[PDB]
């Protein structure tokens, strides 16, 4: 129903916020690894 869809959407969006945070952290480290690779 209406409330089930609305509430589950809110819970999905909270997980998605954490997901984006981890994507940011992961990409930042990938870029660091690439930079260190160039120093070799």
């Amino acid at each position: 129903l209406e409330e089930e869809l609305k509430q589950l959407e809110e819970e999905l969006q909270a997980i998605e916020e954490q997901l984006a945070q981890l994507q940011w952290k992961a990409q930042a480290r990938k870029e660091k690894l690439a930079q260190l690779k160039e120093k070799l």
Partner: nanobody, 118 residues
Framework: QVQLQESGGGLVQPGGSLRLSCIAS????????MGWFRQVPGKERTFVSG????????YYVNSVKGRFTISRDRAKNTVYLQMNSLKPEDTAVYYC???????????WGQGTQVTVSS
């Protein structure tokens, strides 16, 4: 050993805009990335946007896509959040963050209040 100081908050009508800034100073500082989080009373801080320090790659949560833009300047160790098309539900304390090591904890500033009230 690094301090983070925000600026740019305030009170706008729905549809308005604000530009948040955050400057890092102290011991020499080269983070993995910086970002912005937000918090409403009684809840935990939630991610809003982040930028990688080397590449400048940006990330946004779905509720601000197409309205907010993050950027950074390595010369001044400063990160910015341009907040357009503001809505009442964006009302929160916005916090600046630095991803500096692998402890799982970021370094934070002291927050800036953003109020969107019709």
């Amino acid at each position: 050993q690094v301090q983070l100081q925000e600026s740019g908050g305030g009170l706008v009508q729905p549809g308005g805009s604000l530009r948040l800034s955050c400057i890092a100073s102290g011991r020499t500082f080269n983070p993995y990335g910086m970002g912005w989080f937000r918090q409403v009373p009684g809840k935990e801080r939630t991610f809003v946007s982040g930028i990688t320090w080397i590449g400048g790659t940006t990330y946004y949560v779905n509720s601000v896509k197409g309205r907010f833009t993050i950027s950074r300047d390595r010369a001044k160790n400063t990160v910015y959040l341009q907040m357009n098309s503001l809505k009442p539900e964006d009302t929160a304390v916005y916090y600046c963050a630095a991803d500096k090591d692998n402890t799982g904890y970021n370094y934070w500033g002291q927050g800036t209040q953003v109020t969107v009230s019709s």
